[model samples]
Every structure is written in structure tokens, then in C-alpha cells.
Target: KEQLASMNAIANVKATYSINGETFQIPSSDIMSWLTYNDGKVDLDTEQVRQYVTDLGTKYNTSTNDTKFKSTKRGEVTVPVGTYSWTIQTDSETEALKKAILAGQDFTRSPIVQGGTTADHPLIEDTYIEVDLENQHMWYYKDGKVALETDIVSGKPTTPTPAGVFYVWNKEEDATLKGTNGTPYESPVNYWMPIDWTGVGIHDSDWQPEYGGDLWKTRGSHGSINTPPSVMKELFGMVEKGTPVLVF
Candidate 1:
């Protein structure tokens, strides 16, 4: 049931945790946003959340799936060819487990987790988009692996792609992109999949020279994933409203 700890760690612990007489704190609201982003309203102070954690741990972290937590508290956490790292601080063995579960929770939402996993979840019906911004690559998974995979251009430094779990709320094909005070981006795209009301999405970008690598640095989308025309068409069919997207 170690996975249970991660499930509630962040929402419960936040920027501080107490052990005996001392308090520990991390000067960032990053983790706080991550937990809430999952829409996982787990009450770490109670046994209710603990019980759900216990159930999830017992069922999914099976040896067959090898969903066990890695011991390293910091640094690259990846599988299926990717490396993304972050820092987390906590006290007590139980607290650490909670943190680990939060790690997995951040990676993928298991069935029954509320908020993003609830009725409003983008992937509640079993479909998702996984984006690895560090590598500038993305994948579309329906029930199996890789319905489609492609290189991508993410948000830039000033407008970094907001990383977290989110659901696609809208789609607009051949929509003209207008930015900042109705400045029209006459460039028309074939497909548009918007994850939130803010306009961050997975869409085609003919403007880019190429996909993948660090191109997102100097020339990136405005907090969206810029895909090529070829793959963009495929995504039009693969992705849909209510599809959950895991952007990291």
C-alpha cells in the first residue's frame, strides 16, 4: 500500500510538513498546483483518502505491472524512453510514501481518482494524450500503446507549456488563431484540440521549420503543442473532447 502515500502526499503536505517538533518547507507552489491539477481532492488528514490509497495500491501496483515506486527522492523519473526530474521534500517514512504516490498520481491518473478522473475527466472513457515537453515528443494512447506518435513544438520560455493533467474541453478545425487583443494569426491550421479554456492545445503549425529537439526554445507555440500536418490529421481522429492529457 506504499502507493497510497503518493496518492495523497502533495495535497496533504503542500509546502510544509511537521515531524515531532520541526517543520520542513519547500519555497514553491509547484507541487501544490500539481495535486489540485489532478482534481484529486484527497483528504490526507483522514482515513477516507487513506482507504482509497490502500485499495489502489493493492490493485494496480502489481508485480506484473511493476508499478512500484523508485527509491530516489529526486532526479529523472521515467519509463518508455524519457527523463523528467523534480524536487520533493518530506519527513517520516509514511510521508515519503505519500510523496511517491503523488509522483505516480502526477504521471497517470488511475480509475476512481476524482476531479480529473471524475465525470469531468477528459479521459474518463479511456483515451489520452501524453506529452513529454522535455523531449518534445507526444503519444496518443487509446487502450493500447501508440495509436500515433510524433515530434512536437511546445510553449516557449516566457510562455512555458503548463505541465499537469488536464482534459480537452473543445476542438476547432480550421480555426484562425488570434492572440493578444485580437491580433489575428491568419495562418490557418487543419486541426485544433484545446485542453482548457485558455487556448492551450495540440494543433498543426506550418510556421515551424521542424518538429522535435529544442526548437521550442526560440520558437515555440503559445503554451500549446505544435504538431505537423501529417500527424495532426491522425490526431483529429484519435483525440476528442473529454480526452485526458498528461503534459509533463
Candidate 2:
């Protein structure tokens, strides 16, 4: 009967989540489902909490949402969301929700967010890297000014580099990149700036004698942006993790 009473108490507690000015309520019954009454003690089901947060994320997460972007060369255009987009911090939010429920108090707050913001023209703010596939050029903008610009070699027609809003999620020095999807090749690069979860990134190509103009048609990378070693070094020094990379 004590355990039953604990469960009933939990079932009567309510919580609210405010996201982007919208309100979502978690009723008592829903809260009861996320707990376990064992030996007269209520324990939170972590898996249930994660699933609940994930379900909430499906409706509120803006990482995969389409956004409008004003490109430097092509003017304003609508683009799909990429790795650089903002999303809810699922793990942190899950823990937070658990704490809130265990506290046995009705509360309301915004979910923990991660990644880039959603409130700007470029979607990644002013400081970012822009890669022009058509002209085979790349530019790093710091505080909206061109910090560094260089010619680049994009992917071939058969394996075109994706065009969208992404960001530098990681950076590595002197890394060996291996090809996937049955493509057999391993290449070493001095600098690696990954823009996506996939293998797409910007790196140095010492083998290429020339960059820009028709080189991508014949000697392009496997869905990667190839830059000169010197330029890559300079870019590596200029950018850091979370730097937005716009490919168009």
C-alpha cells in the first residue's frame, strides 16, 4: 500500500516544458509511467525519460528543419539543415527531467540546447566558412569580414559535395583518411576540418599540382573539399570546432 501511495503521488505531479514560446504539459499519469515503485521508493526509469525527451525532440528540434540562407554568391536561397544546425541536448535534458520529477514539484523551463543558433541570415551567425563549389573557392569570415580566402577543389560530378548549412564539428592534424562504401583508398592529410557526421571535410591535398577550375571534374576528392597544403594550414589556424561551414 505504501508503494501504491508513492505511485499515486507521482501520478498526481505535473510538469511543463516551454520551448520557443510554446507550452507542453506532462500530466500526472504520464509522469507515473516514467517511474518504478520498488520497496516503497520511487525510482526514475532512465530509458523512459530518454524516450520521452526524444519524442519531444521530434517536434521541437530544429536541427533538421529547413532554413533560408543568404549566400555570398547566389543571393538568398532556401537550404536543408545539416550537421551545423541546433538541436536539443538529449542527454542533459533527460537528466534534468529526471531531477524535476524526483523533486516532486511542478516546474517550467526551456530545454537544454546544443549546436548553432537559429536566429540569423546565414543561420550560423557572421563568423563562418563559405565554400563556393561552382567557382571552387572558399572563404573564412570572422565577424562578417573575410579573414581568409583561397581556391579549393570540390568533389567530382559523380560524388558531389553536399550543399547546405554545416559547421566544423572537429579538427585533426596529420590524419589518415580512409574511404568507405567499397571505395578503396587511404590518403594522408596535414589538416582535417570535418564539417559533417559523414566523411565530408576540408583537408590538404599535396598530390594536386593545381587547385580550382576543372580540377574537381578530373581530380576531385570523395565528397570532400581539397585545399592547398599552405592554405589548409592557414585555415586550420583560423577556424575551430563549431565554426559554421556553408557549402553552396
Candidate 3:
């Protein structure tokens, strides 16, 4: 899976982190903490720690009387170089051990939304949000199907559709793009959906070179739009991260 890596249940296996030859014994508990980093607050929950020590991570290092790391209910914990070992806990029930089968494992299968035959776009009808100048349009998919569509007028030939897949990262109602980035825009627009690395977003444009005419030569408007209060909210639930989107 793209989101999760290794997962297993080992018994009595020694796991350790070595720094300056010092050894730290993991406290005996159902939940154990692992190597973690703190950023002022505390990022005790990370990939290395979460999977390494499922649940019950060390909230703080009280044994060393490290009071400085405390922040409300959470606290920062720093680990020195050394090997740490703790016995792995097993099921308490006394039943005959049998290796049946575990689902959701790698090779097991792909998630419902990923690795499918069809792409679940968001849009119900013809692409809403058209780009007149660029002659391109924005689309939203939902569950291997077209969910919503809207016509839009884009910028002039100088400005073109952007390329790449971007999450609907933000939204702004009563938006403005005329004087953004220090330079004033050629057109006055409302509501912007920036979805490219270059920062070109989808916004109402006055550069409708032909009203119905378009010229989508550049790559700009091909990503998730999550911003500004609108009659249609973003369709995030229909897709996952790393979803490929092409804008040509």
C-alpha cells in the first residue's frame, strides 16, 4: 500500500536503537514508544514510530525528569544512541496456534479507489469551470465515474492550462487575482483554484478571447480544487493521494 509499509507480529524479538553505546530498555506495556522527533510542540506520531511501536508511544521521558519537553498533555521525548529491546506481546487467549490468513496485507489487494479499471472523476455533466482564453476546462470525477462538469473561461493565449495533479489544497470566496504576486493580472477574476507548481489557479476570467473560443496550450488547470465556499464542495472522498491527472 502507498500509505502503509511493514506490519507484523513477532514474539520476543529484540529491537534496539544505538547511539553512544548506551542501551535503553523499552518499558513493559501493551503500547511502546519508538524513535521520534519533536518540533517545539511534538511529532511523536510519525511513520518510523507509529509502525515501529503501534499504539502507546512514550508521551514523555519522565524517568529522566525531562520536564522541559512537556507541553499540555503531550511532551517531547529524545532518545540517545543505544540499542533498545522489549518483548513483543502476543494474544492473551490460550488457543492452538494456527496460521490462517491475514487480509489487507500487501499482494493481498488494492484499495477500492486505487488500481481500478476506470478513473473515478468528479463531475456530473460537461466540464464546469471552462477556460475561454486557454480553451480548456476543469473536471471533477467520482468513483470510476463522471460526477460534475462546468464550462469556464480561462485566460488569454499568454496564460495557459497548467499540468500535474494537485490536491484541492485551499479555497477563497470573493477572491481576487488582479494584483497577485506583485504584478497585476491582465484580467479581473473571482474565486481562484491554484493547482499547479507554477501557482496558476482556476478563477473566473475576463480574458474570454472568444467567449466560446479557447487555446489550452499551457498546463495549469488539471487538479483537485478545494477552496472558497461554493454550491459544490471538493470531491476528495472519491479519490486518494498520488492520483494521476493529465492536462494537454
Q: Write the per-residue lDDT of candidate 3 for residues 6-43, one digit (tens) a residue.
A: 12221112333221122343332311242122443211
Candidate whose lDDT is highest:
2
lDDT of 3 at 207: 38
| TM-score, candidate number 2 | 0.64
Query: Could you tell me the TM-score of candidate 3?
Result: 0.33
Can you write out model 1's per-residue Cα lDDT over 108-185, one digit (the tens) per residue? 222322232221122223356777887788878787556888899998898788865566767888887767524545
The local distance difference test score of model 1 is 0.57
Candidate 2 Cα outliers beyond 4 Å, as residue runs: 1-61, 88-111, 114-122, 180-183
Total backbone clashes of model 3? 47
How much is 153 displaced in model 3, in angstroms? 4.0
Per-residue alpha-carbon lDDT of model 2 for 1-248, expressed as tens digits?
66666666666767888764567688666777787866667778899889888977786665766656667778877666787666778898999988887777678777888766532123456798988888898889999899998888999888889987788888899899997647678999999988888799999988889998889999877899999899899999989788878887
For each predicted model, how many residue pairs clash, with residues at least 3 apart or on different chains?
8, 0, 47
Highest TM-score: which candidate?
2
Query: Candidates' lDDT values, in order?
Result: 0.57, 0.80, 0.30
Pairs with steric clashes in candidate 1: 5-98, 6-98, 6-101, 6-102, 122-242, 122-243, 122-244, 123-244
Estimate the lDDT of model 2: 0.80
